[PDB]
Design an enzyme around this catalytic site. Structure first.
Site, PDB file in Angstrom:
ATOM      1  N   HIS A 119      44.603  34.338  38.987  1.00 55.41           N
ATOM      2  CA  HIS A 119      43.951  35.657  38.949  1.00 55.41           C
ATOM      3  C   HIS A 119      43.373  35.956  37.562  1.00 55.41           C
ATOM      4  O   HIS A 119      42.283  36.523  37.451  1.00 55.41           O
ATOM      5  CB  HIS A 119      44.967  36.734  39.369  1.00 55.41           C
ATOM      6  CG  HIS A 119      44.488  38.146  39.208  1.00 55.41           C
ATOM      7  ND1 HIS A 119      43.991  38.888  40.257  1.00 55.41           N
ATOM      8  CD2 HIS A 119      44.476  38.965  38.129  1.00 55.41           C
ATOM      9  CE1 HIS A 119      43.671  40.096  39.827  1.00 55.41           C
ATOM     10  NE2 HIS A 119      43.954  40.169  38.538  1.00 55.41           N
ATOM     11  N   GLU A 120      44.103  35.552  36.519  1.00 51.31           N
ATOM     12  CA  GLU A 120      43.690  35.765  35.128  1.00 51.31           C
ATOM     13  C   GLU A 120      42.515  34.899  34.698  1.00 51.31           C
ATOM     14  O   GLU A 120      41.628  35.367  33.981  1.00 51.31           O
ATOM     15  CB  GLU A 120      44.864  35.514  34.171  1.00 51.31           C
ATOM     16  CG  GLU A 120      45.994  36.532  34.265  1.00 51.31           C
ATOM     17  CD  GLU A 120      45.494  37.960  34.325  1.00 51.31           C
ATOM     18  OE1 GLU A 120      44.597  38.311  33.527  1.00 51.31           O
ATOM     19  OE2 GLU A 120      45.991  38.722  35.180  1.00 51.31           O
ATOM     20  N   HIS A 123      39.356  36.293  35.702  1.00 48.74           N
ATOM     21  CA  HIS A 123      38.840  37.224  34.689  1.00 48.74           C
ATOM     22  C   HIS A 123      38.173  36.495  33.526  1.00 48.74           C
ATOM     23  O   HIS A 123      37.148  36.951  33.011  1.00 48.74           O
ATOM     24  CB  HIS A 123      39.952  38.128  34.143  1.00 48.74           C
ATOM     25  CG  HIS A 123      40.499  39.098  35.143  1.00 48.74           C
ATOM     26  ND1 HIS A 123      39.700  39.804  36.016  1.00 48.74           N
ATOM     27  CD2 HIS A 123      41.768  39.504  35.381  1.00 48.74           C
ATOM     28  CE1 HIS A 123      40.455  40.589  36.764  1.00 48.74           C
ATOM     29  NE2 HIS A 123      41.715  40.427  36.398  1.00 48.74           N
ATOM     30  N   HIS A 129      38.197  42.884  39.604  1.00 50.11           N
ATOM     31  CA  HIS A 129      39.067  43.115  40.751  1.00 50.11           C
ATOM     32  C   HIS A 129      38.295  43.397  42.035  1.00 50.11           C
ATOM     33  O   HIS A 129      37.324  44.153  42.036  1.00 50.11           O
ATOM     34  CB  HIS A 129      40.038  44.262  40.467  1.00 50.11           C
ATOM     35  CG  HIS A 129      40.983  43.985  39.339  1.00 50.11           C
ATOM     36  ND1 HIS A 129      41.324  44.937  38.402  1.00 50.11           N
ATOM     37  CD2 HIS A 129      41.655  42.861  38.994  1.00 50.11           C
ATOM     38  CE1 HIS A 129      42.169  44.413  37.532  1.00 50.11           C
ATOM     39  NE2 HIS A 129      42.384  43.153  37.868  1.00 50.11           N
TER      40      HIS A 129
HETATM   41  C1  LIG Z   1      48.606  37.599  40.951  1.00 46.55           C
HETATM   42  O1  LIG Z   1      47.429  38.222  40.427  1.00 46.55           O
HETATM   43  C2  LIG Z   1      47.754  39.310  39.674  1.00 46.55           C
HETATM   44  C3  LIG Z   1      47.816  39.209  38.285  1.00 46.55           C
HETATM   45  C4  LIG Z   1      48.147  40.324  37.516  1.00 46.55           C
HETATM   46  C5  LIG Z   1      48.411  41.542  38.139  1.00 46.55           C
HETATM   47  S1  LIG Z   1      48.837  42.940  37.187  1.00 46.55           S
HETATM   48  O2  LIG Z   1      49.217  42.498  35.804  1.00 46.55           O
HETATM   49  O3  LIG Z   1      50.027  43.588  37.833  1.00 46.55           O
HETATM   50  N1  LIG Z   1      47.569  44.005  37.101  1.00 46.55           N
HETATM   51  C6  LIG Z   1      46.768  43.759  35.874  1.00 46.55           C
HETATM   52  C7  LIG Z   1      45.616  42.768  36.139  1.00 46.55           C
HETATM   53  O4  LIG Z   1      44.902  42.870  37.137  1.00 46.55           O
HETATM   54  N2  LIG Z   1      45.453  41.810  35.227  1.00 46.55           N
HETATM   55  O5  LIG Z   1      44.453  40.904  35.405  1.00 46.55           O
HETATM   56  C8  LIG Z   1      48.132  45.377  37.143  1.00 46.55           C
HETATM   57  C9  LIG Z   1      47.087  46.501  37.268  1.00 46.55           C
HETATM   58  C10 LIG Z   1      47.503  47.826  37.176  1.00 46.55           C
HETATM   59  C11 LIG Z   1      46.561  48.845  37.288  1.00 46.55           C
HETATM   60  N3  LIG Z   1      45.278  48.567  37.481  1.00 46.55           N
HETATM   61  C12 LIG Z   1      44.847  47.317  37.574  1.00 46.55           C
HETATM   62  C13 LIG Z   1      45.733  46.245  37.471  1.00 46.55           C
HETATM   63  C14 LIG Z   1      48.354  41.644  39.526  1.00 46.55           C
HETATM   64  C15 LIG Z   1      48.021  40.530  40.290  1.00 46.55           C
HETATM   65 ZN   LIG Z   2      43.403  41.533  37.018  1.00 43.21          ZN
END
Ligand SMILES: COc1ccc(S(=O)(=O)N(CC(=O)NO)Cc2ccncc2)cc1
Ligand SMILES: [Zn+2]
Ligand SMILES: [Ca+2]
Ligand SMILES: [Ca+2]
Ligand SMILES: [Ca+2]
Ligand SMILES: [Zn+2]
Length: 159
Positions: A119-120, A123, A129
């Protein structure tokens, strides 16, 4: 899916990454494996190729941190934000940070490093998202969704 402001993307196809430091939660090889496997999720369905560096500035600097760690988005202890990464560009752009107040695991007993890293790196490659999806902002037979595939392909294309 969604992309970042000003539709930023890597202008090149060969990208370098460096694993700057390591979590105490796992052996180093498990972190390496999750990162490589996270890169392959994206590498397999794009013309992008990832190479590893051990010195100097790589495009995608990967690190583990807690609280304040040199950027405008300090981490928040256990839970909440597990990780974040930056859109394509120079400097901190493209870099991925992981909150080491989470329990990074190889399996699903803690927070799966591979799944967050995938997921990172999304980005790091210009995907924001989704509205459905691996890029959906929530950590919940794994396969990269059509909505995810559509995102990275509407940017770099297929292989
Ligand atoms: C498995 O893929 C992921 C990876 C990280 C996260 S997260 O860290 O819990 N996420 C931060 C986020 O999206 N960082 O890229 C929290 C968030 C809180 C509020 N608004 C937007 C995001 C969730 C799923
Ligand atoms: Zn994210
Ligand atoms: Ca960078
Ligand atoms: Ca956190
Ligand atoms: Ca930790
Ligand atoms: Zn950070």
């Amino acid at each position: 899916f969604r992309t970042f402001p000003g539709i930023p993307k890597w202008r090149k196809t060969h990208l370098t990454y460096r694993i700057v430091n390591y979590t105490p939660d796992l052996p180093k090889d498990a972190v390496d494996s999750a990162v490589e496997k996270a890169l392959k999720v994206w590498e397999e369905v794009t013309p992008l190729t990832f190479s590893r560096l051990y010195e100097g500035e790589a495009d995608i600097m990967i690190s583990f941190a807690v609280r304040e760690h040199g950027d405008f988005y300090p981490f928040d202890g256990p839970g909440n934000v597990l990780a974040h990464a930056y859109a394509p560009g120079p400097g901190i752009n493209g870099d991925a940070h992981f909150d080491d107040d989470e329990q990074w695991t190889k399996d699903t007993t803690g927070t799966n490093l591979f799944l967050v890293a995938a997921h990172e790196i999304g980005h790091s490659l210009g995907l924001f998202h989704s509205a459905n999806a691996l890029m959906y902002p929530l950590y919940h037979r794994f396969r990269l969704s059509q909505d995810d595939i559509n995102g990275i392909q509407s940017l770099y294309g297929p292989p």
